[PDB]
Amino acid sequence: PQNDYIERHIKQHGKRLDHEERKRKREARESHKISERAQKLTGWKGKQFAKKRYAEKVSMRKKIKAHEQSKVKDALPTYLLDREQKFSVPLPKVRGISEEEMFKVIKTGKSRSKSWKRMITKHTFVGEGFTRRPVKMERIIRPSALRQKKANVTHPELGVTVFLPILAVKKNPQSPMYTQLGVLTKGTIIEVNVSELGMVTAGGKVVWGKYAQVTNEPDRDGCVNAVLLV
Amino acid sequence: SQSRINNVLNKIHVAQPQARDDVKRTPFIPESVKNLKKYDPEDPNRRKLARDIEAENGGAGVFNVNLKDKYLLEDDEWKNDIMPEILDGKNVYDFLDPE
Amino acid sequence: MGRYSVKRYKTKRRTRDLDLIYNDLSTKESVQKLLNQPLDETKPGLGQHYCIHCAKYMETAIALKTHLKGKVHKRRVKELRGVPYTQEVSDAAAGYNLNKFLNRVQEITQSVGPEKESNEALLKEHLDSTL
Amino acid sequence: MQLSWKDIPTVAPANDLLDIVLNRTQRKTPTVIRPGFKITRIRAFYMRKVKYTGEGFVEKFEDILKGFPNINDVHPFHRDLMDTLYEKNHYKISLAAISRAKSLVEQVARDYVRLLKFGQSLFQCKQLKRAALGRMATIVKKLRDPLAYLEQVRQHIGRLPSIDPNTRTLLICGYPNVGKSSFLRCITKSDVDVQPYAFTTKSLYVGHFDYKYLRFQAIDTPGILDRPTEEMNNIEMQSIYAIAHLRSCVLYFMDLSEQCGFTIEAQVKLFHSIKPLFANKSVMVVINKTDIIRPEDLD
Amino acid sequence: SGNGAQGTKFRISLGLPVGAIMNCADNSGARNLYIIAVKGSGSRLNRLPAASLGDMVMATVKKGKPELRKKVMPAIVVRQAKSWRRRDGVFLYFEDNAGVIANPKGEMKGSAITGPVGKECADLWPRVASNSGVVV
Amino acid sequence: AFGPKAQRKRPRLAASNLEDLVKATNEDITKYEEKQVLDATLGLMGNQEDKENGWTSAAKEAIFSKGQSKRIWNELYKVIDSSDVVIHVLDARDPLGTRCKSVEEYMKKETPHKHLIYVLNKCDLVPTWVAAAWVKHLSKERPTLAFHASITNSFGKGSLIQLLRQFSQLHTDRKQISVGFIGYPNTGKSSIINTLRKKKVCQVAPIPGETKVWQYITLMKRIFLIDCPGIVPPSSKDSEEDILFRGVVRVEHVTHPEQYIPGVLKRCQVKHLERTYEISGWKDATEFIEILARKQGRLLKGGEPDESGVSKQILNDFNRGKIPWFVLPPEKE
Amino acid sequence: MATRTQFENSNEIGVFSKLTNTYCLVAVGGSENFYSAFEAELGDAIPIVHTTIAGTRIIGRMTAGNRRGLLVPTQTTDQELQHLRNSLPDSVKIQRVEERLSALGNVICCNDYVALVHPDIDRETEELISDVLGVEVFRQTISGNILVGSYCSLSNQGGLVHPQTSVQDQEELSSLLQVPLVAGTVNRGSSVVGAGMVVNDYLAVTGLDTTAPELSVIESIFRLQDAQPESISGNLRDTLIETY
RNA sequence: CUCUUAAGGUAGCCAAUGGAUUAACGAGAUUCCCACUGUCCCUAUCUA
Ligand SMILES: Nc1nc2c(ncn2[C@@H]2O[C@H](COP(=O)(O)OP(=O)(O)O)[C@@H](O)[C@H]2O)c(=O)[nH]1
Ligand SMILES: Nc1nc2c(ncn2[C@@H]2O[C@H](COP(=O)(O)OP(=O)(O)O)[C@@H](O)[C@H]2O)c(=O)[nH]1
Ligand SMILES: [K+]
Ligand SMILES: [Mg+2]
Ligand SMILES: [Mg+2]
Ligand SMILES: [Mg+2]
Ligand SMILES: [Zn+2]
């Protein structure tokens, strides 16, 4: 068969003789079936059924509201219309993180008798030109999978988020030791490259570096989120 | 195109014989074959085929055909006769002989 | 049943049959074909140095000569002296295809036998000359 | 050539695909883990979740990508026909969006397995697995429009007639209502509908017959209006591309009774206008409807 | 019973498990065949798949043409050394194990088969029967 | 664009006229015919006809994928992350064949402060001018040092040591520097380290995978050397034959080595082969193997020559340097 | 007079049946549909016989004969031989042959007047073929192919050889057989034509998968229809050029 | 102030040889091949 052969077949032969009646009775039985499913489905399927029922009812209410609203009834230039898009920090206080949580003891030796190496369990920024220290003298371990270079920065102005490279770690509120180790936890002040935002000072200089505050826990969600400090 | 020429010639040729002897080799068609009436599936009065016999008796895999029914013997009562095979450690078949 | 007989006469370690070797020796064409073989890489001695009686390849001509000077080869030669014992002999001893067996024996004694003997004589003297 | 592309598996939309893959993870991988177990066990549990979900999405995307035809590698007749039917630009952009989603899902799975190697507790490991699955879900949700387009394309392209561009072909062409479909019905057993109104036939129809122990195919085309190519529409583009590509015997049908709605002068103008199309193709003119009026008794 | 086989196949004693090497009885240039799989094989823990006469196997050529080598191809077993029962009333066996190269439809790659072919295999495979000079 | 609610009824870019349409379609058909002829020269003669008869190429042996394990690559990235200087060890017989271009790219992109140089080892296995030309052509890209590794009779040891002293003096801010040795298996990294130490401190063997973990060696108080397991970057153009002739696989685990013997005949000079093996007169690889086996007495039970054993020994001789061969350097400009 | 049928969905008609001018032999397998396909063309004009050879079904490949004789191999039981003798009239000679090459259908290709034989058949088997089948005997190959009975299909009117048979070989074989020869396939490209079809002077039966050009060539060479000689190669040249 | 790419056509100069790629030996560690087989498919049977 070719092209719309089922539609042509219906046009040339019709449907089954009980098609309309059977479809009509199925649609009439739908109300009983929906009630039976709501009371009989169990577990995950029941929870999904209730969730979908709530969403459908919300959608119907919005459609009714829009219909009745219809039945009742920035100052951009010409080339931008018809187009779419206190010195307190936002996190003055964050959860305290102890050294027991921050560091993991690494055991060394054949019988695991030595315990002087420590591994940082959080995400870090190691800076440019990082080379690992030789393994015999490496006390602090900052593994490469937990090293970050870029962050999602939200600008309070214009409400946009951009993926910006990290320039430095300015202040980790937990400790200056974590600051100098480059630990990126919630509330850490970082320096970010803001070159693609196109900022200019009052003197005509181009801004390409500013500060931001980390607003999430990268050890929990695998990424760095920060809000720009403006 | 000269590429598909040789094989076309080789497969389009018909080999022909030429004499080699004065012996007549003529096609042989039996008289009953040449007098046979053509079978018609859509015809009320046709020969009954063995598959029709099978379908009316048991169908395929249930009908048990008798292979002795077509025997051309001197006496037709001999058709359903069991041929003995062994007699006292001897095969009957290698003693069976005219005269 | 015993290990010696099992591992010597296992079916996968079978050797050529004596009636087949008798047929190999009966005709001159078979003798020449088995005497002059193409260089085969997978046979000992590159397919040369083949004793027809024992159906056996030797690595070298000196090996073939030392083999011909042996009781094993003479045993095989003695075995190939008589009628090659087909199934016809067993059938006739049972008393079946008697005329066929007797005709075969007459043909062996009249034609096939002496021709095989002459071929064996020529083959032995050729092996003596070349070895 | 493949010549026919009915064997493409069904393309689920974005929400349905999310349901299928995520519920497959919840069903086919174990769901019970305890905070009292070894951290190695907990990490392996959540790593298996992330990896299995990633593989499910990748297998769906691969089944999509392998099934659909390669528009630039098919015979040029099929390339032009599918371009007319489905808009080649949108076709390739949708398939490329699927390919990009596949790459992003693989990257997310690899990144979060590597992170999960350093998880210290059930809470952190669970948060990392939820982050990985949520990022996969975001990627899939961004595929909503291309998936719906591709599902429509798959359903339509599975029903296209199989046309061999290198076999023996009789092309049938002319104005609407001149008898093209009627002649195809007379010479083949194709079931093309015959009606007294313009453009009953909106796609190419194929029939077959045997002449001197050879299989011939005949192509009925939608009618052609006498317009320039710039104002020619896609329905006529089907016939134009068929005539341009298929080396054949083109049969141009003429009606002298003008019951097609067109005059004899217009039909001759159409012939002389489509004259450049049948170069190095055998051409015949069939004057249909001679039971009404014959060429003998013209003016 | 395999694709291309003609009808059903009754059980025969198995003689060729995976890892066996049989001779090549056709004239396609192969010398022996190494069995790596058996078509129609069942499944049971620790049990080796094995082939009998008239079975289709997947085999590689160990000795023969390099063109035939490094390729996995179907083969049909035409002789076996393991004794098997014929329903007429005799146990019988051949001197060697032997197979012939085929395609998945069971059509012969070579043009002739040297040596006898078991009746069971010949009756199961029509192309083997057509290429056979000796049928036991 | 398409569907129940589609509004496109015309082509976006119509042909200018029917003459343009027919000419473009004729050119497209001719290009398609030529392209299909070109792919029928190879692919239909190969892969497509194998499915018709049901033939399949045998499985790729797991031995040819050695040097590509996650453990080895974890070790490699660890040594790179620890190294201030990275030495890429190349075989003087086939340096471009033994180059790790992907790792060079990654180092130039992600770690530009690490200094990457070339050491061309096994320079005693090629003629003098071949080594000179290879040093000249590789120096256009990176600093290259020709080398012969040996504890007692080496070449280039003083040059390499004074170069590492210059690197240390440049990084006087660091209290010590680390030099990591990377490259293909069996190119001689452990040998070079042993040569610099004048002591057998790293295990050396012709079998691939002799070095399995990294190893620190103190050369001077301010210079450390890091031995690394060999790596083989995956590629699609490189075949199992190329991998085998680069000395990467264990020949004793390959299935049929007689099929790789013709590559030996292609890569080696005939007079050199006949001087190495005291034979002559072969016209093909199988004849060469048979003659060598009969000379050596490598016969099996029954007089068949041991083709596989002789082929494995030949492949070992080629890789271990008992047969002279080299790849010509690029032409002088 | 070329018909198409299958034996239990097999296109190998010549494997499972034997057709001469005066009798037809069929395998016993399953229903009576194969027998009835032959009976629809032959009626009661010649005997159509159900038979087994060594308890097998491959009877066209196990036996050879013509309108005067029928040769069965040494594996035939006394009971099968007796059943064949009871079914056929005395005008057909029936002989059991002691030959090593027991696939007589594969190793003998014959008609009422001549026979091609495998080059290694016995002298006694050749004399028996000459005496019982009543034909001249020639030791031959079809372009290097032994198994002439499976790689050639022959009648008194014409012959079909496998399509890789050269022109010179065709000419020499046609002179030996004194019938016109053509090269072709059967059953949609099969080269084993003798095992693919059966034919006599007034009937040919091939598999269902035989294409219309192959069937037209078969009818032409065997002169099956009333006005269809072997000289319509010129009339079918266009179809054969398009097909080949 | 200066430093490295001058070396060229399948084996060179320079001092038989240019070597630890060391023969032999070894209840030393390791890989593979032939032969061989109840290690196994898949277990059966006999003696004390
Ligand atoms: N009198 C007459 N009318 C015809 C003939 N062929 C077609 N028609 C009529 O013409 C109308 C359109 O024919 P159709 O096959 O749809 O032409 P198409 O539009 O070119 O495919 C139908 O209503 C037919 O009844 C013919 O040969 N004679
Ligand atoms: N002739 C020669 N052989 C060498 C040289 N360097 C190394 N080899 C040999 O090549 C083989 C592999 O050496 P190895 O140090 O283990 O290479 P690795 O895998 O990179 O560590 C050893 O047998 C060495 O003796 C050299 O400069 N010349
Ligand atoms: K090594
Ligand atoms: Mg129409
Ligand atoms: Mg097991
Ligand atoms: Mg090493
Ligand atoms: Zn002897």
Author numbering:
A (entry chain r): 2 to 74, 85 to 96, 117 to 261
B (entry chain b): 350 to 448
C (entry chain I): 1 to 131
D (entry chain b): 1 to 299
E (entry chain V): 2 to 137
F (entry chain m): 140 to 472
G (entry chain y): 1 to 244
Please share excerpts from the published article on this structure.
Biogenesis of the large ribosomal (60S) subunit involves the assembly of three rRNAs and 46 proteins, a process requiring approximately 70 ribosome biogenesis factors (RBFs) that bind and release the pre-60S at specific steps along the assembly pathway. The methyltransferase Spb1 and the K-loop GTPase Nog2 are essential RBFs that engage the rRNA A-loop during sequential steps in 60S maturation. Spb1 methylates the A-loop nucleotide G2922 and a catalytically deficient mutant strain (spb1D52A) has a severe 60S biogenesis defect. Nog2 is an essential hub enzyme that acts as a key quality control element during the nucleoplasmic maturation of 60S, anchoring both the pre- and post-rotation states of the 5S rRNP (Nog2pre and Nog2post) via extensive rRNA and RBF interactions.
Additional evidence for this model comes from two spontaneous intragenic suppressors of spb1D52A (spb1K767N and spb1E769K), isolated during our genetic studies. Both mutations lead to a near-complete rescue of the growth defect of spb1D52A cells. To ensure that the mutations do not simply rescue the catalytic activity of Spb1, we obtained a cryo-EM reconstruction of Nog2pre purified from the spb1D52A/E769K double-mutant strain to 2.4 Å resolution. Although these cells grow nearly as well as SPB1 wild-type cells, Nog2 is GDP-bound, showing that the suppressor mutations rescue the growth defect of spb1D52A despite the premature activation of Nog2 GTP hydrolysis. The suppressor mutations map to the structural, C-terminal portion of Spb1 and insights into how these mutations affect the binding kinetics of Nog2 can be obtained from our recent structure of the NE1 pre-60S intermediate that captures the Spb1-Nog2 transition intermediate state. We hypothesize that the suppressor mutants destabilize the helical structure in the C-terminal portion of Spb1, vacating the region around h92 to allow early, unfettered A-loop access, improving the overall binding kinetics of the Nog2 GTPase domain. Our finding that the spb1D52A suppressor mutations sustain near wild-type growth even though Nog2 is GDP-bound throughout the nucleoplasmic maturation of the large subunit shows that although hydrolysis is necessary for Nog2 release, these events can be uncoupled without affecting the timing of Nog2 release and Nmd3 binding.
